[PDB]
């Protein structure tokens, strides 16, 4: 499974599987627009409960 | 040496999930499509 | 397994630096072309390395002008002898 | 779609969703027109209609759609071609039945 | 696979001479010697390491050539160059490019007058180099 | 954010850019990552984006809907956009928006290329369409309000085609050329 | 992902201890620790995870306590809250409120001062 | 007129949210009163935040009961020792 | 897997694509390395493979066995598919799978040329056979179920030859031509 | 005949903890300790030790979730499993499967982030 896991990490992440593939993305404002929007929303409404969002890749999408 | 290195080509693939180095990172297909060696590993 | 991640990232950083240098050199070449400087890629790269190597900008400019005059004189001599 | 997938697989160039949408815009428009035409010709046909009646309604819909797309002009050229091919194919069984009746004198 | 490293002035000058003259170093020995002699005693403490002056000079030259659009393009290129942290002596690079720049108008085939102005630049000599 | 901005300009409203049926496309809220002057400039561009969105809505209204087979096709042109002239008008509008779509895609690609580009670069690049689109939107709204039908629509377009804006003049020339092509097809059938 | 600047669970637990005890947070440290322990303790699943079932249970409990008017008011408030759609966890809040409902007729069993004896 | 659409909509949304929070707190207070829950506006807001964060109502009720018993015991002890 | 998939379509079931006597060739289970939409595509391909496997089973059942010289050839026709028409039917089925085999070989060559190819290319390339095979399989299953015997099977094929699928029509024409060649040989002997 | 090295239940449990957490066994040490504590604890007998009774309970539970088609499918799968005869402890596996069933209709009472405090 170790070689298979290494391939699975390198053959494109299981995000297409219901298993959450966390992928590294740039925190730049233009690149972290989802994260920046999450930060602004988190900052703006004290009644705002953050919904669970699945991060998907643009290529995957 | 800088000029020999200058003659290096790099991938035009960019993404809007990456901004600090948009030189591509090879999405690397998966579901069959990674080829015979990956299929053998899967088997 | 730990150690391999650093060398790969370093290599990627070096490649990105090379691509950035290439892009910068392309921009410089375009600037020269708009300015009609007449420098080629190899000559431009050599000049870039020389300036990066610490050549005095007044000295570098004078040397470049003298070298260009010498190259033009040599090309004129080659065309006159041909 | 396969050509787009191949270009994605090569991964050499940044392909964005907007780029794909723009590439598919003519095909997407053709799909929308086809969807509307199909809905009118088939989906709008009541289920209990006789197969003859369903066919006749479809044929009349095809004729009217043909008129509409011919009036739509050059912008429908791909759609007009699609409709003309569709008409030829749909008449093929009908034209075959007509041919059999004319040649053999027997309506099969 | 070349990593940038400081190479002796002789190697750079040899390669430069070879590419400029398009001949072997043996065929440019006299020119190489003359250039070496001039270059070997030339340090610029008087040059002000200020990109802004070079950019302004480039803009003025482009305007003189009726190339305001090209001046804007050059400004954008300079902005991109500043965005990249590849070059450290940008003032030197800009000065070299401007000095080696040849006017396409000199578009046309000549340039109207050369009434060089006192405008110029700084002398930096004020510092104890 | 630039990708989101282009998506809003591409007709996908988001959390930053809200679409209002009455107001059109609008910035939904103040974002913490924008200076209020930057927010003001972005909304100023969003005015053009709203006009584009309204144009796209009109395009859907006049080309995206099936022509009702009302027995009298001449009256179909009045209430609903219908008629060969209506199809030509919608086609011309889509053709004129195609260059805008192309410019938007090129802008998206360029912004993807350089992370140091700002919205001011887009505002510069898109200003030509920020001037072009309002006049065509006014013309389309006038066409809708006057219920121009058949070739009488062509006459109105001709009157509007005589505008003074060279880019608007060229666009109206393209539209008029398409309408004249349709007219010439009908004339060919008649002759 | 709209995460309201929710002061950390520790601050909320400390504030709750201070509020309940009528002592400052520093004076409710043992009570704050107790609250943290209770929240950290594994609890059986709540009796009702259905907003409407919790509202109905609250109404039934009020009726059993002969608070029929209070039962109707609870049912009406629950209907209004469900239509309002303001609460994100209606089932949890409704279950909590039902569990916290008190019969005014049943004399509150005053926690004997004696509990303090074992703290030393 | 163009620039105003973001901030004006943001302000209207904030005002609507404030009015909605006030209405929700009033509804919750009425429900608590009918149920004789004893919660105040500040306590109601804290409880709402806790429920929004996912606390188990059975766990929350058990924790609340234990905290209330400890608070009552501490107040009784302070009154008995004074 | 693509080679494994073709082998399953070539009649070699594996761990992913299991052959069931009742269900035919089927994908054994959902695998974690495929998107559920990819799982659906795989299941469609396994449906095609199942149809191919069932066709191969029928081919073996009526052609794969040496003809037993049971003295009464007429009674062979009842229980087991038998008869010169039955042999012709099996031969036609094998000939129709021959073009399918050729297409599968071309797919194999393409996959050998490019290891990065995905299932979508195969699904595009194989869709014609994904449409062809179900209809021929239905026709064969109908022939088997109705116990069409002798030249009366030919009449059913003619009825089936009246199908609307041009490729199915052509395939049934080829099979009918082979059976008619045998029929004509018998008729020649009689005449 | 060297029956594939089915690592002893302790090693299997460690691998399971690592797999469930998506961390290496070394990174799941606190979770491994919790698992070891649970496994060493005396567990009550399963509610049903009859394969058919457990299967019937599973079918009834699926019907209770308004999954009548799923209840029929469960009964059919149970019949198929009983006929297959591969499992030695049908009652235990059936009880486990029943215990692991989740109602899709019951809105998940989102486990407050506070539960993570005790995981360490």
Curated annotation (Swiss-Prot), chains C, H:
Keywords: Acetylation, Cytoplasm, Cytoskeleton
Gene Ontology cellular component list: centrosome; cytosol; gamma-tubulin ring complex; interphase microtubule organizing center; spindle
Highest taxon, organism lineage: Eukaryota
InterPro entries xrefs: MZT1
Subcellular location: Cytoplasm, Cytoskeleton, Microtubule organizing center, Centrosome; Cytoplasm, Cytoskeleton, Spindle
Cystines in this chain: none
Positions bearing N-acetylalanine: 2
GO biological process: gamma-tubulin complex localization; microtubule nucleation by interphase microtubule organizing center; mitotic spindle assembly
Stated role: Required for the recruitment and the assembly of the gamma-tubulin ring complex (gTuRC) at the centrosome. The gTuRC regulates the minus-end nucleation of alpha-beta tubulin heterodimers that grow into microtubule protafilaments, a critical step in centrosome duplication and spindle formation.
Summary of subunit composition and partner proteins: Associates with the gamma-tubulin ring complex (gTuRC) consisting of TUBGCP2, TUBGCP3, TUBGCP4, TUBGCP5 and TUBGCP6 and gamma-tubulin TUBG1 or TUBG2; within the complex, interacts with TUBGCP3 and TUBGCP6 to form a luminal bridge with actin that stabilizes the initial structure during complex assembly. Interacts with TUBG1.
Family stated for the protein in its record: Belongs to the MOZART1 family.
Name assigned to this protein: Mitotic-spindle organizing protein 1
Gene: MZT1
Swiss-Prot record, chain D:
Location of the protein in the cell: Cytoplasm, Cytoskeleton, Microtubule organizing center, Centrosome
Coiled coil: none
Tissue-by-tissue expression: Widely expressed, with highest levels in heart and skeletal muscle and moderate levels in brain.
Disulfide bonds: none
Subunit structure: Component of the gamma-tubulin ring complex (gTuRC) consisting of TUBGCP2, TUBGCP3, TUBGCP4, TUBGCP5 and TUBGCP6 and gamma-tubulin TUBG1 or TUBG2. TUBGCP2, TUBGCP3, TUBGCP4, TUBGCP5 and TUBGCP6 assemble in a 5:5:2:1:1 stoichiometry; each is associated with a gamma-tubulin, thereby arranging 14 gamma-tubulins in a helical manner. Gamma-tubulin at the first position is blocked by TUBGCP3 at the last position, allowing 13 protafilaments to grow into a microtubule.
Family the entry assigns: Belongs to the TUBGCP family.
Described purpose of this protein according to its UniProt entry: Component of the gamma-tubulin ring complex (gTuRC) which mediates microtubule nucleation. The gTuRC regulates the minus-end nucleation of alpha-beta tubulin heterodimers that grow into microtubule protafilaments, a critical step in centrosome duplication and spindle formation.
Name by which UniProt lists this protein: Gamma-tubulin complex component 5
Organism (species): Homo sapiens
Portion held of the full protein: 379 to 486 of 1024
Curated annotation (Swiss-Prot), chain E:
Tissue specificity annotation: Ubiquitously expressed.
Role summary: Component of the gamma-tubulin ring complex (gTuRC) which mediates microtubule nucleation. The gTuRC regulates the minus-end nucleation of alpha-beta tubulin heterodimers that grow into microtubule protafilaments, a critical step in centrosome duplication and spindle formation.
Phosphoserine found at: 113
Sites bearing N-acetylalanine, chain numbering: 2
Oligomer and partners: Component of the gamma-tubulin ring complex (gTuRC) consisting of TUBGCP2, TUBGCP3, TUBGCP4, TUBGCP5 and TUBGCP6 and gamma-tubulin TUBG1 or TUBG2. TUBGCP2, TUBGCP3, TUBGCP4, TUBGCP5 and TUBGCP6 assemble in a 5:5:2:1:1 stoichiometry; each is associated with a gamma-tubulin, thereby arranging 14 gamma-tubulins in a helical manner. Gamma-tubulin at the first position is blocked by TUBGCP3 at the last position, allowing 13 protafilaments to grow into a microtubule.
Protein name, entry field: Gamma-tubulin complex component 3
Assigned protein family: Belongs to the TUBGCP family.
Source organism per UniProt: Homo sapiens
Localization (cell): Cytoplasm, Cytoskeleton, Microtubule organizing center, Centrosome
The encoding gene: TUBGCP3
Span of the entire protein shown here: 1 to 129 of 907
From Swiss-Prot, chains F, I:
Functional note: Component of the gamma-tubulin ring complex (gTuRC) which mediates microtubule nucleation. The gTuRC regulates the minus-end nucleation of alpha-beta tubulin heterodimers that grow into microtubule protafilaments, a critical step in centrosome duplication and spindle formation.
Protein name: Gamma-tubulin complex component 4
Entry's disease: Microcephaly and chorioretinopathy, autosomal recessive, 3: A disorder characterized by congenital microcephaly and chorioretinal dysplasia associated with poor vision and nystagmus. Variable ocular anomalies include microphthalmia, retinal folding, retinal detachment, optic nerve hypoplasia, absence of retinal vessels, round areas of chorioretinal atrophy, and attenuated electroretinogram. Most patients have mild developmental delay and mild learning difficulties.
Subcellular location: Cytoplasm, Cytoskeleton, Microtubule organizing center, Centrosome
Lineage: Eukaryota, Metazoa, Chordata, Craniata, Vertebrata
Domain of life according to the entry: Eukaryota
Family: Belongs to the TUBGCP family.
Tissue: Ubiquitously expressed.
């Amino acid at each position: 499974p170790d070689d298979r896991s290494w391939l699975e990490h390198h053959v494109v992440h299981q995000y297409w599987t219901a298993r959450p593939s966390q992928f590294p993305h740039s925190l730049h404002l233009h690149s972290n627009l989802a994260a920046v929007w999450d930060q602004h929303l988190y900052s703006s409404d004290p009644l705002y409960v953050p919904d669970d969002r699945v991060l998907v890749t643009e290529t995957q999408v | 040496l800088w000029e020999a290195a200058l003659t290096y080509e790099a991938s035009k693939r960019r993404c809007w999930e990456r901004v600090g180095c948009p030189p591509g990172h090879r999405e690397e297909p998966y579901l069959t499509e990674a080829g015979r060696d990956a299929f053998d590993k899967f088997c | 397994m730990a150690s391999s991640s650093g060398a790969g990232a370093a290599a990627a950083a070096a490649a990105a630096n090379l691509n950035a240098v290439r892009e910068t050199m392309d921009v410089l070449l375009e600037i020269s072309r708009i300015l009609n400087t007449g420098l080629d890629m190899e000559t431009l790269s050599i000049c870039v390395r020389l300036c990066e190597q610490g050549i005095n900008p007044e000295a570098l400019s004078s040397v470049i002008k003298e070298l260009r005059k010498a190259t033009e004189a040599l090309k004129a001599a080659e065309n006159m002898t041909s | 779609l396969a050509e787009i997938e191949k270009c994605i697989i090569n991964n050499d160039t940044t392909i964005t969703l907007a780029i794909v949408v723009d590439k598919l815009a003519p095909r997407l428009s053709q799909l929308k027109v086809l969807h509307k035409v199909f809905s009118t010709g088939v989906a709008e046909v009541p289920p209990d209609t006789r197969n003859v009646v369903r066919a006749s309604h479809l044929l009349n819909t095809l004729y009217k759609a043909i008129l509409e797309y011919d009036n739509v002009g050059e912008a429908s050229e791909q759609t007009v071609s699609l409709l003309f091919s569709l008409w030829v194919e749909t008449v093929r069984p009908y034209l075959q039945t007509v041919d059999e009746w004319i040649v053999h004198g027997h309506l099969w | 696979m070349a990593t940038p490293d400081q190479k002796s002035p002789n190697v750079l000058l040899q390669n430069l001479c070879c590419r400029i003259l398009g001949r072997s170093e043996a065929d440019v020995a006299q020119q190489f010697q003359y250039a070496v002699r001039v270059i070997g005693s030339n340090f610029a403490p008087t040059v002000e390491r200020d990109e802004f002056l070079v950019a302004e000079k480039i803009k003025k030259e482009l305007i003189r050539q009726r190339r305001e659009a090209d001046a804007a393009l050059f400004s954008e290129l300079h902005r991109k160059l500043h965005s990249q942290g590849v070059l450290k002596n940008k003032w030197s690079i800009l000065y070299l490019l401007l000095s080696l720049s040849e006017d396409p108008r000199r578009q046309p085939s000549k340039v109207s007058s050369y009434a060089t102005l006192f405008a110029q630049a700084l002398p930096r000599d004020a510092h104890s180099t | 954010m630039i990708h989101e901005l282009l998506l809003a300009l591409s007709g996908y409203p988001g959390s930053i850019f809200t679409w209002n049926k009455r107001s059109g496309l609008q910035v939904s809220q103040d974002f913490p990552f924008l200076h209020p002057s930057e927010t003001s400039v972005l909304n100023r561009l969003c005015r053009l984006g709203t006009d584009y969105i309204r144009f796209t809505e009109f395009i859907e209204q006049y080309t995206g809907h099936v022509q009702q087979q009302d027995h009298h096709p001449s009256q179909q042109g009045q209430g609903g956009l219908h008629g060969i002239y209506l199809r030509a008008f919608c086609t011309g509008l889509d053709s004129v928006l195609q260059p805008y779509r192309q410019a938007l895609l090129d802008l998206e690609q360029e912004f993807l290329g350089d992370p140091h580009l700002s919205i001011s670069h887009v505002n510069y690049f898109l200003d030509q369409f920020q001037l072009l689109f309002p006049s065509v939107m006014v013309v389309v709204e006038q066409i809708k309000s006057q219920k121009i039908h058949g070739c009488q629509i062509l006459e109105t377009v001709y009157k509007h085609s005589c505008g003074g804006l060279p880019p608007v003049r060229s666009a109206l020339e393209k539209i008029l050329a398409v309408c004249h092509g349709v007219m010439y097809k009908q004339l060919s059938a008649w002759m």
